[PDB]
Amino acid sequence: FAIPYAIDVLTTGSYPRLPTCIRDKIIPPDPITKIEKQATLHQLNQILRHRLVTTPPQLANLTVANGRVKFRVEGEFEATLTVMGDDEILVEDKETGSMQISFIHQLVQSRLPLQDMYNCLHSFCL
Amino acid sequence: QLQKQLKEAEQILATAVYQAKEKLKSIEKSSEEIIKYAHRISASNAPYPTDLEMRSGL
Amino acid sequence: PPPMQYIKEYTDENIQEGLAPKPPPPFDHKKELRKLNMSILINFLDLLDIEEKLEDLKLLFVHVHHLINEYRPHQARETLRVMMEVQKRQRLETAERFQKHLERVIEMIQNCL
Amino acid sequence: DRLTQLQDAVNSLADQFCNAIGVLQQCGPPASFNNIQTAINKDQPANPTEEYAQLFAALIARTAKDIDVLIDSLPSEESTAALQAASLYKLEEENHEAATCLEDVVYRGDMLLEKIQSALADIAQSQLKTRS
Amino acid sequence: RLRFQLELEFVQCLANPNYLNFLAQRGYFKDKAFVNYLKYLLYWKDPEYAKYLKYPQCLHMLELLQYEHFRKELVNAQCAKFIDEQQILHW
């Protein structure tokens, strides 16, 4: 018997299609929600605290902003040395005043160990 | 260890089973109706190359 | 093959004003089996002794399909007794797994570990 | 469950039926009643004809045992769904009872999720007093 | 009554990817009435109306082409053949 199909009409669905998991995703994309983004941010941020607890005198002060951690170190060149890391593997977004900063931005990701960047970033500014 | 087992405790429980409730129970109830529904279009499986269409489109 | 001619009945314009009305809708087996298969074999022993017979194989074997499919639902219906009983097992397994932890947590509550 | 394999066995024997008539026809024991080996006709000794014929007969017995054993192994010997429906309703109600216990189990873990977490908050307050 | 009989057949036809692919080429899907004709065809997924349906691929393709993205990729012949082979391999 074709029992699963008889169930499908009851649920207004179909059995044969769910087994293939590649085609069903090729056609449609997925949208996101702002509230879901905040909820995902908060739950992720809880893991950020747990990892950072295990883990830099100046960096001791940090700000967990909307969708990003944030660290600030005073610097020069019309900008402070600022890094925002979100995931150990972290993903870093750095704010400054441009191509050289991108080179520095690339280097930090390449190094990405936490104290090493703390020292490498400190050394360059000095 | 207390914090380790709380995350484990939450994952153990199947949360939001209301979806499975209204889905599985609805399928069950009637179990005597689904059997009768499937007894009359049985052998439903083998393409329909336009042989049945032309009898209808005409 | 043109798709369909009635474009003016379910057009968006009507659906905005209101969806159009929905269309009106348009034991014994074993005893039989235990004797026909034997009789089917008789024809094989008769066809050699004697065309019609080769056409008579299906003519006599057709009795099988008129009867096997009568109880075949019961195999599905009996199969129905097998997964819907597992539905309790699905929920019981979660309860049993939590039961091991309900006592462990209480033991954890009372003990240092 | 088991009847699914019965149909496969039934169809398997059906395929073997046409194979039997495809072997014992152009072949056969070369009898000497008409000394056919002397002239135009072909040759096929009785050794392969007997073995192929005997095997075909054996396959009938193999399926016959499978045919009889499988029909005797059909659970729930009934011809009415009313008896099944009453029995199929009984443990569906039990599943509802199991679902009722699931609600408690879901709540108990949530209660344990807060019963233990309460101390974590309580002790956290203790960790926030001396350092403050 | 006659259009309802045709509607039942169309759903059966709606189970064949090649048929929809031909419809896509002629641009029938550009009409908003067709998209509105489709949502009306959702009624056939219920048990009562589906009792006269013998085949399950109609239900999906109806649901699959509800997405505007699918309609735009069915014009290309490649995706039509990919889906057609999917059904054959599945059987």
Swiss-Prot record, chain A:
<comment type="similarity">
    <text>Belongs to the Mediator complex subunit 14 family.</text>
</comment>
<protein>
    <recommendedName>
        <fullName>Mediator of RNA polymerase II transcription subunit 14</fullName>
    </recommendedName>
</protein>
<comment type="function">
    <text>Component of the Mediator complex, a coactivator involved in the regulated transcription of nearly all RNA polymerase II-dependent genes. Mediator functions as a bridge to convey information from gene-specific regulatory proteins to the basal RNA polymerase II transcription machinery. Mediator is recruited to promoters by direct interactions with regulatory proteins and serves as a scaffold for the assembly of a functional preinitiation complex with RNA polymerase II and the general transcription factors.</text>
</comment>
<comment type="subunit">
    <text>Interacts with GATA1. Component of the Mediator complex, which is composed of MED1, MED4, MED6, MED7, MED8, MED9, MED10, MED11, MED12, MED13, MED13L, MED14, MED15, MED16, MED17, MED18, MED19, MED20, MED21, MED22, MED23, MED24, MED25, MED26, MED27, MED29, MED30, MED31, CCNC, CDK8 and CDC2L6/CDK11. The MED12, MED13, CCNC and CDK8 subunits form a distinct module termed the CDK8 module. Mediator containing the CDK8 module is less active than Mediator lacking this module in supporting transcriptional activation.</text>
</comment>
From Swiss-Prot, chain B:
<comment type="subunit">
    <text>Component of the Mediator complex, which is composed of MED1, MED4, MED6, MED7, MED8, MED9, MED10, MED11, MED12, MED13, MED13L, MED14, MED15, MED16, MED17, MED18, MED19, MED20, MED21, MED22, MED23, MED24, MED25, MED26, MED27, MED29, MED30, MED31, CCNC, CDK8 and CDC2L6/CDK11. The MED12, MED13, CCNC and CDK8 subunits form a distinct module termed the CDK8 module. Mediator containing the CDK8 module is less active than Mediator lacking this module in supporting transcriptional activation.</text>
</comment>
<comment type="function">
    <text>Component of the Mediator complex, a coactivator involved in the regulated transcription of nearly all RNA polymerase II-dependent genes. Mediator functions as a bridge to convey information from gene-specific regulatory proteins to the basal RNA polymerase II transcription machinery. Mediator is recruited to promoters by direct interactions with regulatory proteins and serves as a scaffold for the assembly of a functional preinitiation complex with RNA polymerase II and the general transcription factors.</text>
</comment>
<protein>
    <recommendedName>
        <fullName>Mediator of RNA polymerase II transcription subunit 4</fullName>
    </recommendedName>
</protein>
<comment type="similarity">
    <text>Belongs to the Mediator complex subunit 4 family.</text>
</comment>
From Swiss-Prot, chain C:
<comment type="subunit">
    <text>Component of the Mediator complex, which is composed of MED1, MED4, MED6, MED7, MED8, MED9, MED10, MED11, MED12, MED13, MED13L, MED14, MED15, MED16, MED17, MED18, MED19, MED20, MED21, MED22, MED23, MED24, MED25, MED26, MED27, MED29, MED30, MED31, CCNC, CDK8 and CDC2L6/CDK11. The MED12, MED13, CCNC and CDK8 subunits form a distinct module termed the CDK8 module. Mediator containing the CDK8 module is less active than Mediator lacking this module in supporting transcriptional activation.</text>
</comment>
<comment type="similarity">
    <text>Belongs to the Mediator complex subunit 7 family.</text>
</comment>
<protein>
    <recommendedName>
        <fullName>Mediator of RNA polymerase II transcription subunit 7</fullName>
    </recommendedName>
</protein>
<comment type="function">
    <text>Component of the Mediator complex, a coactivator involved in the regulated transcription of nearly all RNA polymerase II-dependent genes. Mediator functions as a bridge to convey information from gene-specific regulatory proteins to the basal RNA polymerase II transcription machinery. Mediator is recruited to promoters by direct interactions with regulatory proteins and serves as a scaffold for the assembly of a functional preinitiation complex with RNA polymerase II and the general transcription factors.</text>
</comment>
UniProtKB/Swiss-Prot annotation, chain E:
<keyword id="KW-0539">Nucleus</keyword>
<keyword id="KW-0007">Acetylation</keyword>
<dbReference type="GO" id="GO:0000151">
    <property type="term" value="C:ubiquitin ligase complex"/>
</dbReference>
<dbReference type="GO" id="GO:0070847">
    <property type="term" value="C:core mediator complex"/>
</dbReference>
<dbReference type="GO" id="GO:0051123">
    <property type="term" value="P:RNA polymerase II preinitiation complex assembly"/>
</dbReference>
<keyword id="KW-0010">Activator</keyword>
<comment type="function">
    <text>Component of the Mediator complex, a coactivator involved in the regulated transcription of nearly all RNA polymerase II-dependent genes. Mediator functions as a bridge to convey information from gene-specific regulatory proteins to the basal RNA polymerase II transcription machinery. Mediator is recruited to promoters by direct interactions with regulatory proteins and serves as a scaffold for the assembly of a functional preinitiation complex with RNA polymerase II and the general transcription factors.</text>
</comment>
<dbReference type="GO" id="GO:0060173">
    <property type="term" value="P:limb development"/>
</dbReference>
<dbReference type="GO" id="GO:0060261">
    <property type="term" value="P:positive regulation of transcription initiation by RNA polymerase II"/>
</dbReference>
<protein>
    <recommendedName>
        <fullName>Mediator of RNA polymerase II transcription subunit 31</fullName>
    </recommendedName>
</protein>
<keyword id="KW-0804">Transcription</keyword>
<dbReference type="GO" id="GO:0005654">
    <property type="term" value="C:nucleoplasm"/>
</dbReference>
